[PDB]
């Protein structure tokens, strides 16, 4: 058709008129790395390609199954004119940058041939597999060798051979060193938990990518696959390209993983994060204002406003001298309440961190949350699935009722809060894994109350090594005064009859979020003079903790 | 390199970006570019078995005029 | 004929596909068979002839150095498209053999060459389409074996309509005749099943797995389809670091394209020659290092050179270090009987109080080897331990293997073993007694080797470790299970104002030292370190890393001590006088284990000097370990009568 046709002769001209920074163009530099046999980037920009022509990216994106032939004739045309190539080896398009966004959920039936971007996160992990592309047959009537075989998407076969005469009706033979593969993956993506408001249905869709798309794939990718669903007896499968680990849903784009100077992150940044993160970082309250205007429906108890917060950022994964990172995540739990007010401490942090988990003491069996593994349905082979530690990576996991549970599902989780990580070799397979995902418990007392003639160490259900493992551990404070209930009953009226006006923050939710990324960018180092100030403070929790002679209560 | 810099030339971009690396999807850490000839085929400069019996010797007739040129300081010593 | 690098616009695929250049590269390689000239001039290739023939081992095996330095114009052109010079070199062989053997030709034929030594080697992971259909070495340790297949290749069928029987067929997995032009000049006729016209083709499957030395904290292993053919039947056992040299070949299948619209697509690696290294990675280390080594072992204090390095994160515990450092070493296995294999492994049962970090003390050991492995309790079971079924898509049997196995000759590391169930610890024990597994599964027996060191780290029952009770009972563990380790150095923390200035200072200057803001300066900025090295307790210098790792991949594979009879006969009647005064005040007598496990620590400690017999020097400090763990195990009180009494023994160097 004509019309395939003019979108690539005004494509050709796109890579020499419109310039990048200073007056040389970015796909210059990319022109040198294809003649090197091993790398083939074609990375296109989409945010660019419509400042030079609108109409013409229209059709592109709308109907981009039927211009996959042309795109690879004409990328390999101009690249012809800059250095010669040799004519044996082919290329694919890696179309990527895109700023819409399309969810699972929003699919009809005419979802084909449309370049559009999933979300989501992939969860299971499958080995690389060739695939019939160029081949050559051979005929076994007359014995005649086809070439120039294409593969599309059913068995291709040369229904009319060389001879008009007879034809083969039948089957061929695969050529050896005259055939062409191009690898894949069949990995098995899942929905994320935090992008879900409304239904419970969870499923999966098939995501194919390319041959370079590889190695960076393993269980526990929250990446945003870019590509156009194609469909299949008839099924559905998304043909990826190119992948871009970042953040789940929005958010930034640096965490954790790569570092940068100071004056190169200003320029990426918007302008409104700057006097924001500026002038209320040198004030003396910060720490305190932070606690109230995050938790207006809780009166009183300072002590769980202060840990909270901290949760969040804590230590960082430090690097030891022989290259191994031990811990890096400060751990709380809180007891003293049967199930009666402890619960909203966990529903506000849910909401508000989206990586985060909720469960119960029954709802968690012995796997499950962390690795488990089971036989597939349709391979037959022992296969391993991540959990809802794996998912919640670099955030914080919630759980509630400590009591309801067995000893079976503890002991599997003593890697959780000591060294993050998941060691789980089961059958013979090994699935060696991390997550730096602190752990937010919270005990329940065994007579569902503090019970003042029994010991400290006999109303909870907690051992010692349990406690060992831990951090931080916390107390809700019980007071039987007549002022406790007076004031906390002014706080539960004022919410019921003024309904979304008890509200009185100073800053909103908007900028709380946007101080989450600041935090891992300049790290604290440590003073001179505080080494000296640490090792005089341990020995006065040692004797603090042999109350009687040696041990006690708390082990420190 | 010094001796003889018509065989092999590294490019990198140090100093201050990000020291070669690249982190791409096929190993890249400091890669090396052969200084040869265009052939008649119009493709990446390929080298066959008769093609380095000759090339080593290109490269050896830098030791030889070296070899005699220190000679000469050790008979002087003598 | 002459000229090579003139293909004259054909590819590699076609310049050597006719008979025109390969007249001269036949004579030349027929011709270099029988006139071998290697250094001194000596013909050992025509002696290798008359040894291939003994035990009919078609397996004749060549040097790469001897044809790459003879013809320097032939170094490139074989690992170009080897997969068709291989074959047609196949039938030159038999040209040479029956020439000057003439009762060779009443055996069978097609003699399949070798080669071995390959100046390439490529890992299991940067291998995709770019190398298909290419000759390369890909190493990778043997995850497990199958046995002997009846693999259905020749079938025969009575047929009568010419007098001719229909046969042979093809119907290996490597090639098949798919229904439609049949070999017979396409003819077909009636079938009759029969009951011994069936000869079957050898046929093994193996997995290959990654090795577990560059494996992180945080990636997934892959696994790799291995086909082997005849000839080379039975050269591997699972579980063991070898070589295999393979053509990375796509798969041919034949059982899907009669319904399914695609085959399996699948890149396998053929039989071509095998190579069971253990021996040979000490042989190909540099020499500047082994000058060095040397240098440094001349003084009187390298016993504290690596005791002092062993975690430098928690300080304190000396003598928890000194038992990690000797347990990496294993000890060597040999046999002191007469008919009876007795193990010589150093198995170390360590169990604290929780709170002093335990499982810190083995990430550490882990690293600075070759090969170590990690696992948990709730994570593995008798399934997952060292064997356990079938293949349940076309009717297969093969067996699997858990992770001993592949932990040959290594150091492993089990995490939450007092929590195990009772079904698994009453298992294990076949495995830490005979370092070999015989699993009989349909009616196929095959032995291997698993050198393991087992390393656990257990928790006393219900709250804190007791020092009041007995390490026997203590702990939630079967009896036959504990006496079947060596060092059971246990430690108890406690309230101690004499000591404790130093483990709140030692904390917080591994605090900056180990931190990312402070490696910019050091690890990233050579020549320059902010903190220099911390003050030890016994004024030795540490060591970095590359020490730790050119140091086990020597030592244990050169010097191999053997026994002497210097004065052994001293420790028998030692023995009788602790076995006549332990019940004296309430504590159980020294068994047999004790007697024999002195010379698992006299030749550890002789490796570290480099000693070639076993010294005095040796045996005397070997005594005060097993002393100081066997006092743990006990009560304090009874703890005057014996330190008190054996002070002359405790106190030695």
Same mark, same amino acid.
């Given at each position: ?11 050709? &001209?796109?890579?020499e ?28 920009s989409?945010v *660019? ?5 609108q109409?013409?990216?229209?059709t592109?994106? %709308? ?6 032939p042309?795109?690879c ?7 012809? &004119?800059?250095?010669e190539?040799?004519?044996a080896? *082919? ?12 969810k ?6 005419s ?20 695939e ?8 076994? &009537? ?6 120039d075989v ?13 001879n008009?005469?007879?034809?083969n009706r039948?089957?061929?033979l695969l ?15 899942? /929905? ?6 409304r239904?419970?249905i969870?499923?999966?869709? %098939?995501?194919?990518?390319?041959? /370079?798309?590889v /190695?960076?794939?393993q269980a526990? *990718?929250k ?5 156009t ?26 965490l954790?993983?790569? %570092?940068?100077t100071? =004056?190169?992150?200003?320029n990426?940044?918007?302008?409104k %994060?700057?006097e924001?993160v500026?002038?209320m ?5 910060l720490?305190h204002n932070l ?10 108890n300072?002590?769980?406003?202060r840990?909270?917060l901290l ?11 022989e290259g191994?990172?031990?811990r890096?995540d ?8 049967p ?5 909203q ?5 849910? /909401?508000?961190?989206p990586?985060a988990?909720?469960?119960?003491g029954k ?9 488990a ?5 349709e391979?037959?082979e022992?296969?391993?699935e991540?959990?809802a530690?794996?998912?919640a990576?670099?955030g914080?996991?919630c759980?509630?009722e400590?009591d309801?549970?067995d000893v079976?599902?503890?002991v599997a989780?003593?890697?959780?809060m ?12 090994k ?7 602190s ?5 329940n007392?065994?007579?569902?109350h503090?019970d003042?003639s ?7 259900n907690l ?14 404070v019980?007071e ?5 209930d ?7 009226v004022d919410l019921?009859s ?6 009185d923050?100073?800053?909103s939710? *908007? ?9 891992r960018?300049?790290?604290?180092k440590?003073?001179?003079e ?5 090792? =005089?403070?341990?020995k006065?929790?040692?004797?603090? &903790?042999?109350?009687?002679v040696?041990?006690?209560?708390w082990?420190? | ?17 990000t020291f070669?690396?690249?982190?791409r999807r096929?190993?890249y850490?400091?890669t ?5 000839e265009?052939e ?5 400069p ?9 090339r ?8 030889v005029?070296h070899?005699?040129?220190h000679?000469?300081?050790f008979?002087?010593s003598? | ?7 004259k ?12 250049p390969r007249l001269?590269? $036949? ?5 270099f068979?029988r006139?071998?000239?290697?250094? $001194? ?9 008359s040894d291939?023939?003994?035990?009919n ?14 013809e320097?114009?032939?170094?490139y ?6 997969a ?9 062989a ?29 890992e299991l ?12 070495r890909?190493s990778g340790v ?16 009575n047929?009568?309509?010419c007098?001719?029987?229909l046969?042979?067929?093809?119907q290996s ?5 798919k229904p439609?032009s ?15 016209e069936?000869?079957?083709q050898?046929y093994?499957?193996?997995?290959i ?6 494996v ?6 892959? !696994? ?11 050269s ?5 670091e ?7 070949h796509?798969?041919?299948?034949? !059982? ?7 085959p399996?697509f699948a890149?396998?690696?053929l039989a071509?020659?095998?190579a ?5 990675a000490?042989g ?19 016993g504290?050179?690596?005791?002092? !390095?062993?975690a430098? !994160? ?7 270090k ?5 347990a990496?070493?294993?000890?060597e296995?040999k ?38 492995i990690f ?8 399934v ?12 297969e049997?093969?067996l ?8 040959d000759?290594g150091?492993?590391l089990i ?12 298992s294990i ?13 349909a009616?196929i ?6 050198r ?8 006393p029952?219900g709250?804190?470790?007791?020092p ?6 203590n702990?939630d563990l079967?009896?036959?299970?504990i006496?079947?380790?060596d ?11 004499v ?11 591994? $605090?900056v030292?180990?931190?990312?803001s402070?490696?910019?300066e ?9 903190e220099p090295?911390?003050?030890?307790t ?7 890393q ?5 140091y ?10 053997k026994?002497n ?5 001293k ?7 602790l076995r006549?005064?332990?019940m ?5 007598p020294?068994?047999?284990? $004790? ?5 698992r620590?006299?030749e550890a ?16 400090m070997?005594?005060r ?9 006990q009560?304090?009180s ?7 009494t ?8």
């Amino acid at each position: 058709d004509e019309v395939a046709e003019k979108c690539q002769k005004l494509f050709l &001209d796109f890579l020499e008129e419109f310039q990048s920074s200073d007056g040389e163009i970015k796909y210059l530099q990319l022109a040198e790395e294809l003649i090197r046999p091993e790398r083939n980037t074609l990375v296109v920009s989409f945010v *660019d390609l419509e400042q030079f022509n609108q109409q013409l990216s229209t059709t592109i994106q %709308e109907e981009f199954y039927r211009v996959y032939p042309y795109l690879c004739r004409a990328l390999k045309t101009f690249v012809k &004119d800059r250095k010669e190539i040799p004519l044996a080896k *082919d290329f694919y398009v890696a179309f990527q940058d895109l700023p819409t966004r399309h969810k699972i959920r929003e699919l009809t039936s005419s979802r084909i041939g449309l370049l559009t971007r999933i979300s989501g996160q992939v969860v299971r992990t499958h080995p690389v597999h060739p695939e019939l592309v160029s081949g050559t047959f051979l005929c076994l &009537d007359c014995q005649t060798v086809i070439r120039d075989v294409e593969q599309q998407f059913k068995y291709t076969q040369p229904n009319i051979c060389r001879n008009p005469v007879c034809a083969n009706r039948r089957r061929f033979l695969l050529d050896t060193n005259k055939s062409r593969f191009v690898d894949f993956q069949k990995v098995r993506i899942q /929905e994320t938990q935090a992008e879900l408001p409304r239904g419970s249905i969870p499923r999966s869709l %098939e995501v194919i990518l390319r041959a /370079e798309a590889v /190695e960076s794939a393993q269980a526990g *990718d929250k990446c945003d696959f870019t590509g156009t669903l194609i469909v299949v007896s008839y099924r559905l499968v998304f043909l990826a390209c190119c992948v871009a680990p970042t953040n789940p849903r929005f958010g930034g784009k640096e965490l954790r993983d790569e %570092e940068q100077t100071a =004056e190169s992150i200003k320029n990426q940044m918007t302008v409104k %994060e700057w006097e924001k993160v500026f002038e209320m970082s040198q004030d003396k309250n910060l720490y305190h204002n932070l606690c109230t205007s995050l938790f207006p429906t809780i009166h009183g108890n300072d002590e769980v406003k202060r840990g909270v917060l901290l949760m969040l950022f804590g230590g960082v994964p430090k690097t030891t001298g022989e290259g191994t990172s031990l811990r890096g995540d400060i751990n709380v739990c809180i007891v003293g309440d049967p199930s009666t007010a402890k619960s909203q401490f966990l529903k506000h942090v849910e /909401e508000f961190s989206p990586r985060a988990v909720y469960t119960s003491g029954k709802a968690s069996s012995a796997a499950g949350l962390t690795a488990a593994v089971v036989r597939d349905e349709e391979s037959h082979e022992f296969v391993i699935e991540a959990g809802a530690l794996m998912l919640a990576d670099n955030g914080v996991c919630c759980i509630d009722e400590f009591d309801k549970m067995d000893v079976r599902d503890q002991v599997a989780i003593h890697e959780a809060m000591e060294q993050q990580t998941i060691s789980i070799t089961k059958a013979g397979v090994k699935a060696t894994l991390n997550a730096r995902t602190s752990i937010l418990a919270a005990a329940n007392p065994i007579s569902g109350h503090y019970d003042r003639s029994k010991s400290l160490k006999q109303n909870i259900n907690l051992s010692a090594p349990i406690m060992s493992r831990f951090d931080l551990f916390f107390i809700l404070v019980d007071e039987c005064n007549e002022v406790t209930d007076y004031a906390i009953a002014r706080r539960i009226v004022d919410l019921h009859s003024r309904i979304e006006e008890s509200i009185d923050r100073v800053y909103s939710l *908007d900028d709380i979020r946007r101080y989450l990324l600041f935090a891992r960018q300049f790290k604290p180092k440590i003073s001179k003079e505080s080494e000296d100030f640490i090792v =005089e403070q341990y020995k006065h929790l040692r004797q603090r &903790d042999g109350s009687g002679v040696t041990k006690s209560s708390w082990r420190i | 390199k010094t001796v003889y810099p018509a065989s092999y030339r590294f490019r990198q971009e140090r100093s201050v970006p990000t020291f070669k690396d690249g982190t791409r999807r096929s190993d890249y850490q400091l890669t090396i570019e052969p200084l040869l000839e265009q052939e008649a085929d119009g493709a990446a400069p390929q080298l066959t078995a008769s093609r380095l019996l000759q090339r080593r010797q290109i490269f050896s007739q830098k030791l030889v005029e070296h070899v005699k040129e220190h000679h000469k300081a050790f008979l002087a010593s003598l | 004929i002459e000229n090579l690098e003139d293909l004259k616009g054909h590819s590699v695929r076609e310049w050597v596909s006719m008979a025109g250049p390969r007249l001269e590269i $036949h004579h030349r390689f027929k011709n270099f068979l029988r006139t071998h000239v290697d250094s $001194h001039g000596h013909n050992v290739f025509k002696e290798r002839i008359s040894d291939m023939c003994k035990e009919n081992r078609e397996s004749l095996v060549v040097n790469y150095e001897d044809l790459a330095a003879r013809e320097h114009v032939l170094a490139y052109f074989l690992p170009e498209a080897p997969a068709e010079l291989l074959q047609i070199f196949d039938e030159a062989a038999l040209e040479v053999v029956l020439a000057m053997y003439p009762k060779y030709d009443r055996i069978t034929n097609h003699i399949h060459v070798r080669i071995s030594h390959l100046p390439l080697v490529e890992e299991l992971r940067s291998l995709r389409q770019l190398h298909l259909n290419q000759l390369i070495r890909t190493s990778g340790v043997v995850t497990s074996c199958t046995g002997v297949l009846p693999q259905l290749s020749m079938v025969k069928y009575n047929c009568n309509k010419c007098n001719f029987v229909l046969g042979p067929f093809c119907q290996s997995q490597n090639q098949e005749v798919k229904p439609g032009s049949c070999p017979e000049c396409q003819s077909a006729g009636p079938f009759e099943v029969n009951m011994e016209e069936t000869i079957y083709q050898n046929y093994q499957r193996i997995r290959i797995q990654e090795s577990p030395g560059k494996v992180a904290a945080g990636r997934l292993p892959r !696994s790799k389809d291995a086909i082997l053919l005849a000839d080379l039947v039975d050269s591997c056992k699972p579980g063991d670091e070898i070589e295999l040299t393979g053509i990375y070949h796509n798969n041919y299948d034949g !059982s899907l394209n009669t319904a399914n619209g695609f085959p399996v697509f699948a890149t396998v690696i053929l039989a071509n020659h095998v190579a069971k290294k253990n021996k040979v990675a000490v042989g190909e280390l540099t020499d500047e290092d082994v000058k060095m080594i040397t240098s440094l072992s001349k003084d009187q204090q390298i016993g504290e050179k690596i005791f002092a !390095s062993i975690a430098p !994160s928690i300080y304190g515990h000396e003598d928890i270090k000194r038992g990690l450092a000797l347990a990496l070493f294993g000890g060597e296995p040999k046999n002191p009987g007469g008919k009876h294999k007795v193990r010589g492994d150093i198995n170390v049962l360590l169990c604290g109080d929780p709170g002093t970090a335990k499982s810190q003390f083995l990430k550490y050991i882990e690293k600075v080897s070759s090969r170590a492995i990690f696992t948990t309790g709730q994570g593995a079971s008798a399934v997952g331990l060292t064997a356990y079924q079938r293949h349940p898509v076309s009717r297969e049997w093969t067996l699997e293997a858990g992770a001993l196995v592949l932990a040959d000759r290594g150091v492993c590391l089990i995490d939450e073993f007092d929590k195990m169930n009772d079904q698994d610890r009453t298992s294990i024990h076949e495995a830490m007694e005979q370092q070999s597994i015989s699993i009989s599964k349909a009616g196929i027996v095959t032995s291997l080797q698993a050198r393991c060191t087992v390393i656990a780290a257990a928790n006393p029952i219900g709250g804190r470790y007791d020092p009041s009770l007995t390490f026997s009972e203590n702990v939630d563990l079967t009896e036959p299970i504990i006496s079947r380790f060596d060092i059971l150095c246990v430690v108890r923390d406690t309230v101690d104002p004499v000591q404790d200035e130093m483990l709140a200072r030692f904390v917080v200057g591994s $605090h900056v030292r180990h931190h990312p803001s402070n490696k910019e300066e050091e690890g990233l900025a050579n020549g320059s370190a902010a903190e220099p090295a911390m003050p030890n307790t016994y004024g030795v210098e540490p060591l970095p890393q590359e020490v730790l790792k050119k140091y086990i991949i020597y030592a244990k594979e050169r010097v191999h001590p053997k026994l002497n009879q210097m004065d052994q006969d001293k420790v028998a009647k030692m023995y009788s006088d602790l076995r006549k005064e332990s019940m004296a005040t309430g504590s159980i007598p020294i068994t047999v284990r $004790h007697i024999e496990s002195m010379i698992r620590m006299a030749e550890a400690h002789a490796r570290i000097h480099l000693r070639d017999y076993v010294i005095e020097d040796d045996v005397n400090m070997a005594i005060r370990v097993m002393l100081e763990s066997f006092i743990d195990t006990q009560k304090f009180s009874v703890m005057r009568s014996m330190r008190k009494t054996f002070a002359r023994y405790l106190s030695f160097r």
